[PDB]
Amino acid sequence: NPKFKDLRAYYTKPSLEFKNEIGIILKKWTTIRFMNVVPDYFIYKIALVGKDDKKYGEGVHRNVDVFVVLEENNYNLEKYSVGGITKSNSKKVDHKAGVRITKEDNKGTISHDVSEFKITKEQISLKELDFKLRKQLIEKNNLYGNVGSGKIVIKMKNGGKYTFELHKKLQENRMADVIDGTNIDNIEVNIK
Ligand SMILES: CC(=O)N[C@@H]1[C@@H](O[C@@H]2O[C@@H](C)[C@@H](O)[C@@H](O)[C@@H]2O)[C@H](O[C@@H]2O[C@H](CO)[C@H](O)[C@H](O[C@]3(C(=O)O)C[C@H](O)[C@@H](NC(C)=O)[C@H]([C@H](O)[C@H](O)CO)O3)[C@H]2O)[C@@H](CO)O[C@@H]1O
Ligand SMILES: [Cl-]
């Protein structure tokens, strides 16, 4: 009940997608480092968390895509987002993955729904997957209305999996983890 409010608000935030941009990293001036992205005359500050800190050194980084979710921060920054950095596509991707949703309402009834998640990137961040999928589950399945727990599992063609626990926000460090979008096989969602 109480926890759903915060999650529903976060996962209904607006997002932005920047592709084929350049990232600019200057000397560390605070506790976390940032990649600056300037698509159209405003500077986006992307926190470098988890694996991204060692992945991007000072200087210019070409072929950068960013999945952006602006949010509040303790650094006094106006256009701040965490993770979501990937390598731009070498060429167009036109792929898709079936989503299988099992939901048990607050009355015990078990239902099923299906959707198709469209994949247009070779490399996709767990940030993007987690965010887009939860937003879809809120809009179409009322996630965080009556029920707000369970899991999203991204199943890969090689047998790998990536799990997002629905009762809390995706851990920040994992927002920088990236996977092969073309190798996503299907997605399983269980809400309870
Ligand atoms: C304090 C904190 O934020 N710690 C996180 C780890 O999360 C904690 O430990 C977990 C075991 C769990 O108890 C969680 O609730 C805690 O916050 C985090 O560990 C990942 O947690 C997620 C669930 O939130 C998964 O359990 C993940 O295991 C898997 C996965 O299913 O997603 C296993 C899977 O085999 C593996 N896939 C491959 C191909 O290797 C994936 C994958 O490594 C991750 O999804 C990539 O993000 O992991 C736990 O690893 C941990 C992940 O690095 O980060 C902080 O330490
Ligand atoms: Cl695995």
To one decimal place, what's the resolution in Å?
A: 1.9
Start-end ranges of CATH 2.40.50.110 in the chain? 13-88
174 lines ligand 1 (CB under 6 A): yes
Start-end ranges of CATH 3.10.20.120 in the chain? 1-12+89-192
Structural fold of domain 1-12+89-192: Ubiquitin-like (UB roll) (3.10.20)
Contact between 50 and 88 under an 8 Å Cβ cutoff? The reply is: no
Q: What do you get for the CA distance between the two ends of the chain, in Å? A: 12
The residue assigned the tokens 């927002």 is: 175
Q: What is the CATH number of domain 13-88?
A: 2.40.50.110
Locate 28 and state its tokens. Answer: 């560390």
For residue 89, give the DSSP letter: P
Cα separation, 133 vs 138, whole angstroms: 9
CA–centroid distance, 123 to ligand 1, in Å, is 19
Locate 19 and state its tokens. Answer: 């592709």
Q: Name which of 170, 182, 187, 180 is nearest 50 in CA terms.
A: 170
Locate 54 and state its tokens. Answer: 């060692």
Locate 23 and state its tokens. Answer: 């990232």
152 backbone dihedrals φ, ψ, rounded to 5°: -110, 125
Bridge-based pairing state of the strands 95-104 and 184-191: parallel
| Residue 188 exposure: Cα atoms within 13 Å on the Cβ side | 6
* Cα angle 64-94-55, degrees, rounded to a multiple of 5: 25
Q: Name which of 69, 81, 84, 94 is nearest 11 in CA terms.
A: 69
CA–centroid distance, 179 to ligand 2, in Å, is 12
Q: Residue 135: enclosing H or E segment and its boundaries? A: helix 126-141
* Residues within 5 A (CB) of ion ligand 2: 160-161
Q: What approach was used to elucidate this structure?
A: X-ray
Residue nearest to atom 7 of ligand 1 (CA): 171
